Design a protein around this ligand. Structure first.
Ligand SMILES: Nc1ncnc2c1ncn2[C@@H]1O[C@H](COP(=O)(O)OP(=O)(O)O)[C@@H](O)[C@H]1O
Ligand SMILES: Nc1ncnc2c1ncn2[C@@H]1O[C@H](COP(=O)(O)OP(=O)(O)O)[C@@H](O)[C@H]1O
Ligand code: VO4
Ligand code: VO4
Lengths: 256, 263, 95, 256, 263, 95
């Protein structure tokens, strides 16, 4: 009864907020940014994207080295080492390069959008900005949000490119697989307009829900540096619940 | 004696104590008024209301008829481009150096040419007490150097209203004597409007034009410093010299000890 | 605001940062045909000295020849209060 | 020219910084904790583990639903729907439940060990503790580190258990696969002492390098709340480089 | 006149300016000595050295012969369990309420029984000026209430040496009159040892026993307040009344403007 | 430190928080055979009053008899300075 009603109130308040973040989101994009916006916009790419680049190559190199390592050894027993190039491509492209690219991005830059705005909340460096007079929704939010949208499809292609080229390195350089059957296994089965293009349309709505939460949950948080970490998980928790919760609608609309 | 800020009657409870109940203030144009008083009033929480951050609950703030929180968000940033405010423990933009903190509201509101933009950039730092500690990181600075840099960007644009919030908190008695000149010397020269919140009775009475000592929710004494000390109510007499006589919470619990258990 | 003729370039009434661009480069257009610079700038007509009064006046002399050739009269009794606020000595012509 | 010696020597204060963190690490474990240590130790489990529990079920439920969904449809064409239970088990157990369990753990609690200690650095919370006199290496580090070691193998088993039970839900309830061939596919091919035990020994050294970095990089950081986010990535970057960099030695020592 | 802290000659450069060069101080047992001076000295950076946080470069700090940073890390926490220190802008243990901030160093150093542990818990808050604002979050408090709560935990254990660091920064003139009693009333009653760093010349001279004024790296004036004002060197005379005459950086750049380009 | 006999329980020399446990429950062991409590506690032998002198003395009475039956003499000329520091009135016996 007591704790139950407590949790109820909790859920209600949470849902109420969420809605808010919607009311924030229109107010950022439905205004034309001024001069000086692009200069911070480049620096946010310098902050979010270029710093995120060194990570996803290594985890890109890894997963191809694993996925072409183990399925083949069971698959070679019947007749197929030529379908190695298909199974590495069609599971990275339509399944993992949307999903696992974001969970490394929600890791690095899904935090550093919150704690950089959890920065300006504790020392009132948000409040001073309003008091001098800017609006941080134009100043420190909108160049942050517009880099977050752009830079993730700019990475998840980069990710899967080394993802496939990684699995080539285990195949032809150590397992001795035929090069021609490797690539022409892919060429026949991986169309462009149905897989790589629809691997992007997954990665855009995986970029919006990951970066809009990580902006809002750093803005409307109380400046307590304990709860700056409980606000930190609600970036990651609500991202990973929704970046996985909206794969299953996006897999069904594309195919099935 | 036309005013800028015309506070109508206010009620406000953000700590569910008694704070600011049915109080009305007026800030005459071209006068240094200091909002002091004991600890029984929200720190600058009055000045957040003139900023329009916290909400007047049954209040009514009239900025020349143009009502704060009845106006638009576009006009409010146009209204908050009228004020300079040094904060309590002065909020500096960390990441940026001293050359960029004071040039922050300059660059945010340029309206001239390229050169004349850069002209006033090198002109303000000679105008304040500076232009030889430009590129130091806001890391190497103390409370005496916190508000000093923070005051530079507060006076950066020439305002129509400027607030100070305890500038005399980390200063030496020489430099606070310079600062008490530096506040008023701007005021007679540029006919602006100041609001100071502080508690240092000697120089504040010798610099203000109209005081306002509020105890918990209401005025205790208003007017010029001549009539204010001349008409000390028995809360003002106890406040002027710090007479150890007052209804403050010296001890909170006034219960017994002999019959009080100690968990 | 407006700078006049009869050889003398006067600052009159205001400086308010929506201007002193069109009065700078056209106000300098007199100075190139003001040889040896006997022209006087009466600043006590200034009446709004606010560190932007410090700006364009000396911005001619950045593009001029002589340093103390171009003359000035005097502060409008408020600009001086800025002078020791910048600890300043004899800087301009104190006619 | 000075940039390449500014980018030069950047390893050196980093390798001297890493050499400090080793010297810290002995000083935490080589002392016997006092009374009152277990009480904070439980609360750290309440902080790190119990809060992390709600995430890894959902991403546990997901990956089994995907991996048994797509490989079968190519595998069914020859003779094999009975080896569905093997390929789901032997890639989760010896390959992903070490790796992908940490990258969600380095996401949530790999941050909240830094920002909770990036809390006490900015308001001199740390410095006051020394000044009153405790040692935070005994007080706020050692109950944090000992929860981080314990709680990750306590999760990655939990992860893969729903990971396998997730893929059962797509198989027998939607693809109509035989239940007996499903489980007895696993019981013949998945030994206990070589897979599930050696899936733990991967997850311990994936827990130590993930949590010791996330303690140190929050302790010896400058209190600037911009660089509290650049210190935040170096938790995630150096974790994900080493949690992936030490799979490849651990795969080779176990088998191959 | 036996001392506790015996500073030998020191050099220290953490901002590569001139700071503390060949200076030696002595803190006699049972005396309230105030280390005043202008902004030209590291804020408490002296008191970090007695804490042993920053390193004396060619310094030598003798705590009764037991040398700081020659001792062990085990004995240093045993040495740092001798001191109470209110910080600059008082570091409170956020989240933890007022009942837990002052009970923090009490619980960290219990040596009695369960009851007598809890006995002194309810006894300190009546002993300070409190025990009716126990469970408020350190969120609702200002600079006047920051150091007030922070002073409670500074005096929590009875020390052999206790430092204060600008307690008179947010106080009203009544309550700072109580606080100037509250500092010294402990000192005569419990024969402890205080070190205050502040700049408020009236009450500091009437409360200290030996004040030291340092300008940039060296003593300007030492001793009892009688001989100190009686022997004012022409840096001490300028620092007392506050007469505006001094070698401070009023303006930094003392170059021209006519021949100075404006980027 | 040590509390004595001849019916009177005296606090003598120190209270220093490594003690007043073994002197509390054994010091109370006199009080249960001190009926109507005519016993006097001479506190001017205390000489180290530090709010721990406030502790165990009243901790007998917590469960003792009448609230003003047990007697005390007087402060040792330093403990009083704590009294108005807690704004205190007549609290204990001022014999
Ligand atoms: N979030 C908040 N916003 C505004 N005021 C608050 C908030 N939380 C608490 N307060 C109130 O502000 C008061 C702070 O004390 P204050 O009057 O500012 O001290 P001082 O007068 O010394 O500045 C508290 O009494 C509290 O009730
Ligand atoms: N990390 C640091 N630790 C100690 N001192 C520093 C550090 N960084 C800068 N400083 C020095 O501390 C000084 C701070 O000024 P300070 O003398 O504290 O002002 P005030 O005397 O008003 O307290 C600066 O001059 C700077 O050189
Ligand atoms: O500490 V000072 O702040 O001024 O000296
Ligand atoms: O009143 V204050 O005392 O601090 O603000």
């Amino acid at each position: 009864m007591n704790t139950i009603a407590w949790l109820g109130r909790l859920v209600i308040e949470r849902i109420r907020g969420i809605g808010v973040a919607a009311l924030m989101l229109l107010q950022i994009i439905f205004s034309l940014p001024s001069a000086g916006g692009f200069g911070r916009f480049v620096y946010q790419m310098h902050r979010v994207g270029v710093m995120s680049l060194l990570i996803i190559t290594v985890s890109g190199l890894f997963i191809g080295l694993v996925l072409g390592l183990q399925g083949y050894s069971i698959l070679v027993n019947v007749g197929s080492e030529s379908m190695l190039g298909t199974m590495v491509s069609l599971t990275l492209l339509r399944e993992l390069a949307p999903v696992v690219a974001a969970l490394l991005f929600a890791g690095r830059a899904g935090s550093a959008l919150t704690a950089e705005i959890g920065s300006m909340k504790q020392s009132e460096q948000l409040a001073s900005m309003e008091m001098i007079g800017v609006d941080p929704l134009k100043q420190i939010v909108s160049p942050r949000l517009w880099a977050g949208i752009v830079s993730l499809p700019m990475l998840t292609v980069i990710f899967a490119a080394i993802g496939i080229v990684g699995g080539k390195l285990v195949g032809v350089d150590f397992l001795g697989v035929d090069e021609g059957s490797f690539w022409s296994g892919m060429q026949n089965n991986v169309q462009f307009g149905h897989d790589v293009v629809n691997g992007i349309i997954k990665s855009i709505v995986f970029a919006l829900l990951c970066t809009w939460i990580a902006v809002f949950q750093g803005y409307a948080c109380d400046p307590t540096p304990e709860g700056i970490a409980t606000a930190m998980t609600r970036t990651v928790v609500y991202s990973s619940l929704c970046v996985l919760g909206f794969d299953f609608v996006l897999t069904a609309v594309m195919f099935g | 004696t036309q005013s800028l800020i015309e506070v109508k009657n206010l009620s406000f409870n953000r700590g569910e104590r008694v704070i600011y109940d049915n109080i009305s203030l007026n800030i005459r144009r071209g006068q240094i008024t200091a909002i002091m008083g004991p600890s029984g009033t929200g720190k600058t929480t009055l000045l957040r209301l003139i900023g329009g951050q916290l909400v007047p609950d049954q209040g009514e703030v009239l900025l020349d008829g143009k009502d704060i929180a009845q106006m638009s968000r576009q006009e409010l940033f146009a209204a908050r481009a009228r004020m300079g405010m040094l904060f309590q423990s002065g909020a500096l933009f960390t990441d940026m150096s001293v050359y960029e903190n004071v040039a922050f509201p300059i660059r945010a509101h340029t309206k001239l040419s390229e050169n004349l933009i850069a002209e006033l950039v090198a002109l303000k730092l000679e105008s304040v007490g500076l232009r030889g500690t430009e590129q130091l990181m806001p890391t190497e600075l103390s409370g005496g150097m916190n508000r000093r840099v923070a005051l530079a960007r507060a006076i950066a644009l020439d305002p129509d209203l400027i607030m100070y919030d305890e500038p005399f908190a980390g200063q030496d008695p020489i430099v606070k004597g310079v600062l008490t000149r530096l506040i008023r010397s701007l005021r007679e020269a540029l006919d602006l409007t100041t609001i100071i919140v502080s508690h240092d009775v000697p120089e504040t009475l010798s610099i203000a034009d109209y005081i306002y000592v509020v105890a918990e929710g209401k005025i205790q004494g208003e007017g010029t410093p001549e009539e204010l000390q001349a008409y000390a109510s028995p809360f003002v007499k106890q406040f002027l010299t710090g007479s150890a006589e007052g209804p403050v919470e010296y001890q909170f619990s006034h219960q017994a000890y002999l019959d009080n258990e100690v968990r | 605001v407006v700078q006049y003729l009869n050889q003398e370039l006067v600052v009159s009434g205001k400086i308010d940062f929506e201007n002193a661009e069109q009065q700078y480069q056209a106000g300098l257009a007199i100075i190139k045909k003001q040889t040896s610079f006997p022209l006087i700038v009466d600043l006590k007509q200034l009446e709004h000295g606010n560190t932007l009064a410090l700006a364009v006046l000396v911005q001619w002399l950045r593009q001029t020849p002589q340093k103390s050739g171009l003359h000035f009269k005097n502060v409008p009794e408020k600009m001086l209060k800025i002078i020791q606020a910048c600890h300043l000595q004899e800087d301009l012509h104190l006619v």
